[PDB]
Design a protein around this nucleic acid. Structure first.
Lengths: 213, 25, 62, 136, 98
RNA sequence: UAUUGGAUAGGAACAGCUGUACUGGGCAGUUACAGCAGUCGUAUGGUAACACAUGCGGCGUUCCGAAAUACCAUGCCUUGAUA
RNA sequence: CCCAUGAACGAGGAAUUCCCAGUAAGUGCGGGUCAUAAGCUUGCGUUGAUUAAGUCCCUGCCCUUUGUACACACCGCCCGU
RNA sequence: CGCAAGACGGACCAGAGCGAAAGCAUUUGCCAAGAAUGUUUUCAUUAAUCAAGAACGAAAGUCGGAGGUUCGAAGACGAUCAGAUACCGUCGUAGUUCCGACCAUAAACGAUGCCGACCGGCGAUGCGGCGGCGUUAUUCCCAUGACCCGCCGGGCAGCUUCCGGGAAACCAAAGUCUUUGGGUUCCGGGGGGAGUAUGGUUGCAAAGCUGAAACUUAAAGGAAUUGACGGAAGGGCACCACC
């Protein structure tokens, strides 16, 4: 008999300040009545939000996971969590008569943000190729995958969490792999397809305000 | 009669014989 | 709720179990761009009007 | 019901999880997080026939009540997330996905970015049926 | 007699292959035996695409496709009319119809 | 300015067998009907008890609210009677 | 031919037949049968519709592939207690 | 949003690869092996096929320990049905998973023994080697990586021929066969009774290997042809069919 959508306060969720679009949208949680607090209620939420929603005029096939780590009173301060490629582009790249080469690495930043980067890469049909099947031998796959691991660990170990997301907003990692692995076997659709933050250090709001200021 | 099932019926017959011949031992 | 009309722009043969439903390409009279495919009971010549009691259902073609 | 939002240059976005299996249709609507939900109407709440919980008629009634409910709270745009049965079962979205998606937009809703998020198993467990499958 | 030269399958120098299940039934069929399709179908084919891309926010949004690979056993692939009974000489044709 | 509200109106699944109609024919179910098995009341015979006989009649059943029901399979078998 | 007698039957269960234009259906009249003679059959006119211009869903028919242990050819052949 | 445990290795994945066969697919490392190739290396007949004998041998099944989420013999119920101890559905025990022993069979198939010789084309494909216009990356050119055009060897296969054979179907082998002989192992003798009985042997068991006879019977069978038939497909048709 009661009305459940009277105790629902709206909060403007904000993307971290290393983007061109800040306000993502609104989220609701219950009013802070008795035991359950609102400021502990909407603090564990992930927003799977595309790059077209965050950059100026970008591509819509790269989604970023964004967690709220702080509620500043009618203001959520969303931190970088993870990254995923969409079903569409991922399932569009996998076709017959070519070799798929996946790689993974478990590497941390200069601050203690332990990530897990997944790479993918596909072999190319040359601009005069008549032979159909166009495969890579196992020792060519093993060398590509070795350099996929090398460049991913290289360009994440150097710098901190802002500088690796700003290396993922334009795909500067995947283009280093597509150009570096040319003189083994030329690859065409090379992407860091998924990033998955495993471990996270003790929270300091002073340095979340750097990502939101 | 399917040859599997014929072979299954001759299999149970032979278990019945081995059982009924271990009596006279 | 509305009760809408649609004019027969093209006939698409004859469906059903006993060959009784005429499959028809109809054109709406709110928008003359918006077309749907409709099953009709009874004799239909091309260029007459039907009364649609639900304007949402679109039939299975062949 | 209470929204402080001006109707000048805004679409306030919900997320529509449409789970069209071969015997039902879920037209579940949430906030952008997924956690806090607004409305879910199923095909089986619109027909009194277990047969027709699947039906493409019932799936458009589900979206009509979802779009009626979403306007009162004041969510005016939707991020569609289509889904099949998934797992080691069928990846084909069922026969009332295109009815629940047609009827959403024509009830005065705005469609955002769409994705087919059926749970694909990279190497599944043993499928119910047996070696010789389902003998009809 | 011997109906087909290859025994209606595509293994020539193996002995064993991994078996997979059907889609409509779950008949555990060898991978190289099964009648396979890879359909790249629009989520909303042509009927709704007008009433979806005109009620979308984004300027000229191209709607995402639905990629699914479907495995069929011989028993069902005929019932679903994916493959047909063919003339003894027409059987030998390997090219697919466009 | 009609929500309601009993009741009779009125629909339903439930069977004790032959017969006809479903079939080229047979056994099954299935439907509609009539006769009589059961059945209730009745006059007599009989008895301390009394449970049956006789001959004469009456005889569905439970549901209590609507009913627009997909009603699939509409099952299997086929002279020794002459090549 | 006359007068008297004034029975069931309130639109017919399951099932089922014929039919698409001067057609169905109604109402008469001829011919054959015929010493006597039309609830029949075969012809003719008269009044004159409803619904359809379709499909293979039932029942069956004709082609082409296909499968078969059938050839008195599915009303076939054949298994076991 | 997490967390937990146990299976599995999607799409890429092919008439592609490897292995004696059974079989084998997530990354990285370690271990020992093998084919083909190349070679003006080495020994110099050391070889081929093989009763007895030996190693490996899917799945199911058996024994002892750990594990159990999915699936699921037996089992329980709900449907269907003339009955349905089946098909359909909801649950489920052994099993399915790992370790250490067992058993030794499959339509274990190419229903096709192995080694060697000869006998038509054609385009591909995998691996190694060789040669040759050019394109492309390493830019700082060569050798190399990725393409392009041929060559040689070994390999999984295709298409195509009146080679020739075959009962045909079909087969570059199933050919080189009354113009019958390269070497060699296994093995068949009309259909049943029958892989049965009985002996022997193997195994914890289940069962494996070797294995008759009395008696019964004029056919059982292989390939192709035509017709009929179909609860087979495609194309038409009929108010003695439907709408």
């Amino acid at each position: 008999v009661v009305d459940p959508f009277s105790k629902k306060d709206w909060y403007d969720v904000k993307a971290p300040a290393m983007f061109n679009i800040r306000n993502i949208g609104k989220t609701l949680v219950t009013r802070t009545q008795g035991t359950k607090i609102a400021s502990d209620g909407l603090k564990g939420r992930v927003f799977e939000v595309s790059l077209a929603d965050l950059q100026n005029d970008e591509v819509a096939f790269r989604k970023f996971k964004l967690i709220t780590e702080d509620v500043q009173g009618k203001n959520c301060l969303t931190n970088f969590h993870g990254m995923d490629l969409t079903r569409d582009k991922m399932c569009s790249m996998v076709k017959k008569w070519q070799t798929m080469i996946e790689a993974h690495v478990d590497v941390k930043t200069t601050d203690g943000y332990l990530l897990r980067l997944f790479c993918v890469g596909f072999t190319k049909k040359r601009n005069n190729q008549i032979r159909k099947t166009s495969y890579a031998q196992h020792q060519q796959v093993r060398q590509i995958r070795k350099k996929m691991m090398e460049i991913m660990t290289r360009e994440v170990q150097t710098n901190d969490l802002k500088e690796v997301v700003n290396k993922l907003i334009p795909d500067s990692i995947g283009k280093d792999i597509e150009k570096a692995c040319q003189s083994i076997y030329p690859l065409h659709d090379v992407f860091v397809r998924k990033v998955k933050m495993l471990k996270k250090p003790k929270f300091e709001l002073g340095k979340l305000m750097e990502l939101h200021g | 009669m399917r040859a599997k099932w014929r072979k299954k019926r001759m299999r149970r017959l032979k278990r019945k014989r081995r059982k009924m011949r271990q009596r006279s031992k | 709720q509305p009760i809408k009309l649609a004019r027969v722009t093209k006939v698409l043969g004859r469906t059903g179990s006993q060959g009784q439903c005429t499959q028809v390409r109809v054109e709406f009279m709110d928008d003359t761009s918006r077309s749907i495919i409709r099953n009709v009971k009874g004799p239909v010549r091309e260029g007459d009007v039907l009364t649609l009691l639900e304007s949402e259902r679109e039939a299975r073609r062949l | 019901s209470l929204g402080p939002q001006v109707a000048e240059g805004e679409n306030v976005f919900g997320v529509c999880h449409i789970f069209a299996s071969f015997n039902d249709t879920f037209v579940h609507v949430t906030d952008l997080s997924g956690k806090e939900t607004i409305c879910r109407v199923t095909g089986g709440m619109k027909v009194k026939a277990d047969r027709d919980e699947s039906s493409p008629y019932a799936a458009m009634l589900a979206a009509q009540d979802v779009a009626q409910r979403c306007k009162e709270l004041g969510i005016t745009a939707l991020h569609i997330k289509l889904r099949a049965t998934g797992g080691n079962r069928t990846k084909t979205p069922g026969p009332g996905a295109q009815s629940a998606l047609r009827a959403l937009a024509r009830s005065g809703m705005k469609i955002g970015r769409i994705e087919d998020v059926t749970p694909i198993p990279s190497d599944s467990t043993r499928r119910k049926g047996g070696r010789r499958g389902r003998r009809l | 007699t011997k109906k087909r030269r290859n025994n209606g399958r595509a293994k020539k120098g193996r002995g064993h292959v991994q078996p997979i299940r059907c889609t409509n039934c779950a008949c555990c069929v060898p991978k190289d035996k099964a009648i396979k399709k890879f359909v790249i179908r629009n989520i909303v084919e042509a009927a709704a695409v007008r009433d979806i891309s005109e009620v979308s926010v984004f300027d000229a949004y191209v709607l995402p496709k639905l990629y699914v690979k479907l495995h069929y056993c011989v028993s069902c692939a005929i019932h679903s009319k994916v493959v047909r009974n063919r003339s003894r000489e027409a059987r030998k044709d390997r090219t697919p119809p466009p």
